Amino acid sequence: AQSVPYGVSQIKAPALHSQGYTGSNVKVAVIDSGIDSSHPDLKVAGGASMVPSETNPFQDNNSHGTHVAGTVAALNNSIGVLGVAPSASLYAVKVLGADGSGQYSWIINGIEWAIANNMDVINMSLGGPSGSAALKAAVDKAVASGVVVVAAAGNEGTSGSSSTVGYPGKYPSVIAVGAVDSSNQRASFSSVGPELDVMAPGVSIQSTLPGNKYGAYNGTSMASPHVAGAAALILSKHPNWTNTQVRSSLENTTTKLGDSFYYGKGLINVQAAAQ
Amino acid sequence: KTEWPELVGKSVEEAKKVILQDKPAAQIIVLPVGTIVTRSYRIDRVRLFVDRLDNIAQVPRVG
Ligand SMILES: [Ca+2]
Ligand code: NA
Numbered sequence: 001a002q003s004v005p006y007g008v009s010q011i012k013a014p015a016l017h018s019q020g021y022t023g024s025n026v027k028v029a030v031i032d033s034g035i036d037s038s039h040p041d042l043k044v045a046g047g048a049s050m051v052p053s054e055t056n057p058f059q060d061n062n063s064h065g066t067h068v069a070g071t072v073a074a075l076n077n078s079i080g081v082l083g084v085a086p087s088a089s090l091y092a093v094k095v096l097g098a099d100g101s102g103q104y105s106w107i108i109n110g111i112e113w114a115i116a117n118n119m120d121v122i123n124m125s126l127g128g129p130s131g132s133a134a135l136k137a138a139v140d141k142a143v144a145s146g147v148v149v150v151a152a153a154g155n156e157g158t159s160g161s162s163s164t165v166g167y168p169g170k171y172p173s174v175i176a177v178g179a180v181d182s183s184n185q186r187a188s189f190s191s192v193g194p195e196l197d198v199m200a201p202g203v204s205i206q207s208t209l210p211g212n213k214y215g216a217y218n219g220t221s222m223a224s225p226h227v228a229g230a231a232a233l234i235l236s237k238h239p240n241w242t243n244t245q246v247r248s249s250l251e252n253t254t255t256k257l258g259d260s261f262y263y264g265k266g267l268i269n270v271q272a273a274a275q
Numbered sequence: 276k277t278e279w280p281e282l283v284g285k286s287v288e289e290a291k292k293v294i295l296q297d298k299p300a301a302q303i304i305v306l307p308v309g310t311i312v313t314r315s316y317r318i319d320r321v322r323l324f325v326d327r328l329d330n331i332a333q334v335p336r337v338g
Contacts, residue, residue, distance in 0.1 A: 032313075033313070062313070064313045064315055067315075095311075096311070096312075096313065099304075100312060100313045100315075101306055101310050101311065101312050101313075102310070102311045102312075103310070103311070104309065104311060106311075107311050125313060125314050125315075126311050126312065126313055126314060127311060127312070127314060128309065128310060128311045128312065129324075129333055130308070130309065132309075152314035153314075154314060155314055155315075155316045155338045156336070157277075157278075157336070159334075166314075187316070189316045189338055217315055217316075217317075218315070218316045219313075219314050219315040219316040219338075220314045220316075221313055221314035221315045221316075222315070224314070
């Protein structure tokens with residue numbers, strides 16, 4: 001039996017599916033710890049590993065990349081969960097190792113692979129508190145090349161009036177995604193600041209895990225792929241829209257939630273965004 | 276309880292002593308300052324980010 005995680009419904013993805021738009025032929029790179037391609041609820045289209053000692057991107061020794069991938073594109077079938085964009089072409093771009101961490105140069109290599117391979121969407125459920133000029137250059141290059149680039153805002157909560165949005169989310173070229181729960185309330189951990197762009201469900205998100213398993217986790221890591229999946233739904237309906245158009249469409253049709261410091265533009269609504 | 280501003284500049288063993296007193300189930304992970312990490316929020320985890328001298332460089336928090 002298949003279940004639809006609340007977050008998928010909350011962003012109105014099933015409205016798109018019912019119209020016949022499920023992300024077909026849109027290339028989404030999950031730049032993360034790999035994806036367990038043996039999961040029966042996932043189809044991985046391709047990928048590459050940038051992690052020197054973990055060279056198979058189709059093995060996920062951590063679990064995080066597999067969960068993130070299932071939110072983007074868990075298959076529409078009779079098992080497990082349903083992804084936001086269940087027909088999307090999912091690419092395992094492994095830049096984190098088994099312990100869930102990576103070097104900046106591995107991330108940058110993953111971003112460069114996604115650009116060279118003409119990905120339509122990049123999801124980065126990762127980050128760090130300081131950027132680097134090289135990391136900024138790579139995401140800016142991706143956007144200039146036409147890639148919709150989405151990233152977790154961070155889980156650093158509040159710090160007086162200071163931004164706690166981490167990198168690469170904090171870069172203007174990158175859509176920084178914060179986390180809400182099923183009542184659209186901000187998760188206490190969700191990073192804040194003027195760089196917060198939109199929110200998506202990021203609390204008790206049920207998705208795929210290695211070993212043909214499922215479980216529910218919290219984080220802006222879980223929020224980000226709802227938006228990467230939404231980008232894919234939009235592009236499956238409107239294959240000629242630019243990354244600029246997909247981005248404004250998502251930002252302009254949100255359900256407004258509150259103060260932009262804490263909630264950005266509010267909750268994405270992919271039904272409204274796709275028209 | 277979720278963050279430890281008083282541990283900035285402390286050693287790793289120092290940081291672990293205060294964390295484990297406040298939060299005995301903590302799963303403590305030590306990483307260099309300039310590392311990329313996942314954005315899952317894991318209630319039992321405390322990441323410790325360290326400078327060149329192996330001291331706490333960022334306010335430790337749960338997640
Ligand atoms: Ca399924
Ligand atoms: Na203020």
